[PDB]
Amino acid sequence: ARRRRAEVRQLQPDLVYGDVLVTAFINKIMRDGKKNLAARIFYDACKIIQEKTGQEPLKVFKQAVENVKPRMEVRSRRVGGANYQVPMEVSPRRQQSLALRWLVQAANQRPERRAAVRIAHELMDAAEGKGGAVKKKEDVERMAEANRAYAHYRW
Amino acid sequence: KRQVASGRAYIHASYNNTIVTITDPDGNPITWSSGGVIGYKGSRKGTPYAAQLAALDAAKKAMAYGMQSVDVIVRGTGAGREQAIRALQASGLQVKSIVDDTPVPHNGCRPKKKFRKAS
Amino acid sequence: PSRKAKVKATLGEFDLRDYRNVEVLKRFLSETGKILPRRRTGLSGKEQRILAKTIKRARILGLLPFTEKLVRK
RNA sequence: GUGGGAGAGGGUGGUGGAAUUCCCGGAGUAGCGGUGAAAUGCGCAGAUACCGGGAGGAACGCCGAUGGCGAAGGCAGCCACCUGGUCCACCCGUGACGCUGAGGCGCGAAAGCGUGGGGAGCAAACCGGAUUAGAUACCCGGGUAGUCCACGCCCUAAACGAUGCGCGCUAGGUCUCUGGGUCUCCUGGGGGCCGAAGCUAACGCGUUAAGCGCGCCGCCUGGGGAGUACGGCCGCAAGGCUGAAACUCAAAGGAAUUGACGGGGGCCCGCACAAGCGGUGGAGCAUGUGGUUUAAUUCGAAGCAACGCGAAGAACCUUAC
Numbered sequence: 174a175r176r177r178r179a180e181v182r183q184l185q186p187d188l189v190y191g192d193v194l195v196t197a198f199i200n201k202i203m204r205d206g207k208k209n210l211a212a213r214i215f216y217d218a219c220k221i222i223q224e225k226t227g228q229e230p231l232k233v234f235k236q237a238v239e240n241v242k243p244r245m246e247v248r249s250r251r252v253g254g255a256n257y258q259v260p261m262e263v264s265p266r267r268q269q270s271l272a273l274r275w276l277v278q279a280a281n282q283r284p285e286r287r288a289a290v291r292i293a294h295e296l297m298d299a300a301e302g303k304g305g306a307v308k309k310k311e312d313v314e315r316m317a318e319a320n321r322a323y324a325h326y327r328w
Numbered sequence: 329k330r331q332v333a334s335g336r337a338y339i340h341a342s343y344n345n346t347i348v349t350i351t352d353p354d355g356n357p358i359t360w361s362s363g364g365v366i367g368y369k370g371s372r373k374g375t376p377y378a379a380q381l382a383a384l385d386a387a388k389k390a391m392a393y394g395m396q397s398v399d400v401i402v403r404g405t406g407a408g409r410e411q412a413i414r415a416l417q418a419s420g421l422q423v424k425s426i427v428d429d430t431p432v433p434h435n436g437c438r439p440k441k442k443f444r445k446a447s
Numbered sequence: 448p449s450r451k452a453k454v455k456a457t458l459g460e461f462d463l464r465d466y467r468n469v470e471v472l473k474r475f476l477s478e479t480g481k482i483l484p485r486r487r488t489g490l491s492g493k494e495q496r497i498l499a500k501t502i503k504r505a506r507i508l509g510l511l512p513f514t515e516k517l518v519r520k
Numbered sequence: 521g522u523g524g525g526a527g528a529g530g531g532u533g534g535u536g537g538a539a540u541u542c543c544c545g546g547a548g549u550a551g552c553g554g555u556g557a558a559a560u561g562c563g564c565a566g567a568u569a570c571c572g573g574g575a576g577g578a579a580c581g582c583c584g585a586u587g588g589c590g591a592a593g594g595c596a597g598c599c600a601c602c603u604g605g606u607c608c609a610c611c612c613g614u615g616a617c618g619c620u621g622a623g624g625c626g627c628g629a630a631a632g633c634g635u636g637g638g639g640a641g642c643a644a645a646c647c648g649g650a651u652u653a654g655a656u657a658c659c660c661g662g663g664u665a666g667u668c669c670a671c672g673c674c675c676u677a678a679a680c681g682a683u684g685c686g687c688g689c690u691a692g693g694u695c696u697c698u699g700g701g702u703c704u705c706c707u708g709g710g711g712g713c714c715g716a717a718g719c720u721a722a723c724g725c726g727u728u729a730a731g732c733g734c735g736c737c738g739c740c741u742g743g744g745g746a747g748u749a750c751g752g753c754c755g756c757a758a759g760g761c762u763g764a765a766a767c768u769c770a771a772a773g774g775a776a777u778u779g780a781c782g783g784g785g786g787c788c789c790g791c792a793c794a795a796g797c798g799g800u801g802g803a804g805c806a807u808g809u810g811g812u813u814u815a816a817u818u819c820g821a822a823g824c825a826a827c828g829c830g831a832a833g834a835a836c837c838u839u840a841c
């Protein structure tokens with residue numbers, strides 16, 4: 174990425190909720206390019222958000238993704254004599270990429286042996302403000318700013 | 329406690345730390361702070377942030393004496409001089425003025441090696 | 448680059464060797480009590496050299512300052 | 521000579537404000553200082569930061585310049601006194617009274633020496649703290665001589681324009697300091713830059729010559745040995761001046777050229793880093809290799825660019841042991 178600002182890939186809107194943000198999440202759940210099994214998993218997960226929540230699946234989803242978005246994150250950087258963990262604002266873009274990554278990550282750190290469940294349960298624990306995902310998000314925000322003494326290394 | 333309401337705020341900037349001193353209209357200190365008073369103890373006392381906290385600590389402590397408006401006086405250069413100037417303004421205290429009064433000799437004492445060969 | 452009407456223009460006749468004319472000399476000092484350069488004084492090499500000698504006399508008499516504190520920053 | 525001018529030129533006395541340190545008083549409290557990060561250090565016997573009073577030493581901010589003065593070293597707050605040089609105008613006076621200058625005599629940055637004084641800050645040596653593989657250094661905290669004054673020594677230097685002094689001659693352009701004029705501009709003295717002709721190995725120099733010429737002084741004659749030894753002179757000393765030989769080398773050396781290089785600068789690329797996804801390094805095994813073993817373990821490949829490579833087929837064969 175030395176020559177251009179690398180445009181962002183536009184993803185094919187969802188084959189159901191038609192939302193693009195969903196396809197994104199599905200791609201993260203995916204592995205070994207099993208686009209099928211991936212999407213399936215995300216869908217039975219919306220079905221579980223149903224049989225346990227009178228609320229719309231998609232609504233729960235986008236809600237969680239929102240609480241998992243870090244607005245600040247510490248980025249390393251050298252200033253001669255040591256590396257200073259420098260706090261810094263997080264891009265609208267990176268926020269989403271991070272939120273989604275973390276959800277799948279936490280979801281798979283859960284106990285229930287059914288994939289579709291973990292995702293579902295994680296999406297919920299998130300909507301409320303709990304769960305391994307929101308944890309990282311809060312661990313980083315606090316981990317950043319906790320170094321506010323290096324706010325003058327803007328970058 | 330003693331009630332002053334109006335006084336002065338001195339900011340001593342240094343490339344090693346910033347320290348603020350609030351005083352009555354005659355220049356007698358009422359309270360003070362610095363990067364060291366707040367947590368910081370190494371090279372962070374110099375930080376613009378440390379200066380901020382030191383500045384706010386100073387104001388609040390001077391609220392206890394019921395002070396409200398100050399006359400800021402700045403001395404020295406130093407990472408975090410301006411943050412203090414700002415930290416005060418936005419802190420209940422009414423900044424009536426800001427004045428730079430850093431001492432500079434009309435060339436008298438030979439500097440330490442570290443500060444020579446200048447100009 | 449220091450263009451705000453040189454102090455000489457905005458002024459009339461005056462004895463550059465008069466160390467007591469505070470109202471006139473005072474003009475050649477900056478916000479601080481520092482002697483303005485030539486870019487500001489507008490004076491000439493020879494004139495400016497006499498201004499200095501003059502001002503430094505004023506200062507010792509107390510009519511003029513050596514240094515001023517800057518109001519702002 | 522007369523009349524004007526500029527200047528940190530020199531000497532003596534006086535004197536002004538800023539800052540640092542220390543002392544005193546106030547107010548005030550837990551740190552300050554310092555670095556890459558730290559520590560030594562200082563602070564509750566109250567430091568740091570702030571206000572007021574005092575003492576002392578040293579140096580003069582802005583003006584300040586690409587500026588000015590001096591033979592050089594060098595000279596910078598302001599005032600007075602004493603004193604040097606120098607430029608211009610007027611063509612007034614003398615009438616070649618001139619140039620250079622071995623030796624002599626004087627001056628001569630810093631450090632250093634002697635006697636006495638002074639001592640704020642800074643600081644060889646030195647005492648400590650860090651750093652490092654070590655660190656008799658670079659960084660940090662201290663600190664004596666010294667730095668300052670007087671008187672007397674020392675006499676060196678990248679004491680440099682690395683360019684001896686004087687005079688005459690040879691296009692201009694442009695900025696500048698200082699004087700005179702009919703004051704767009706002309707004219708004299710000084711400081712810069714670009715350049716005619718010309719010079720130069722080149723770089724460059726070019727009316728401020730490194731050009732063209734004359735006068736006088738100083739100096740050079742390959743490198744190392746060596747600015748040493750000896751002698752002499754000088755010095756309180758440190759040491760200065762003058763200044764070799766044996767031996768030994770095929771060079772030492774100047775300028776410029778093309779590269780290469782840089783813990784030099786600028787601009788710019790690559791899955792180079794960063795962002796990210798999967799993996800190796802751990803296990804079992806397959807395979808190549810090192811090593812070791814063997815009668816033989818055929819040979820080659822070696823960091824990248826050797827190691828599932830030559831081997832796209834080793835039971836005999838292949839096969840070189």
Ligand SMILES: [K+]
Binds near residue numbers: 438
């Ligand atoms: K000095």
Ligand SMILES: [K+]
């Ligand atoms: K301590």
Ligand SMILES: [K+]
Binds near residue numbers: 552568
């Ligand atoms: K301090």
Ligand SMILES: [K+]
Binds near residue numbers: 587
């Ligand atoms: K000069």
Ligand SMILES: [K+]
Binds near residue numbers: 665666
């Ligand atoms: K000594």
Ligand SMILES: [K+]
């Ligand atoms: K001296």
Ligand SMILES: [K+]
């Ligand atoms: K002498």
Ligand SMILES: [K+]
């Ligand atoms: K004239």
Ligand SMILES: [K+]
């Ligand atoms: K030539």
Ligand SMILES: [K+]
């Ligand atoms: K050149």
Ligand SMILES: [K+]
Binds near residue numbers: 730
């Ligand atoms: K020559």
Ligand SMILES: [K+]
């Ligand atoms: K001798």
Ligand SMILES: [K+]
Binds near residue numbers: 754
């Ligand atoms: K003698």
Ligand SMILES: [K+]
């Ligand atoms: K002797």
Ligand SMILES: [K+]
């Ligand atoms: K380069």
Ligand SMILES: [K+]
Binds near residue numbers: 791
């Ligand atoms: K790579």
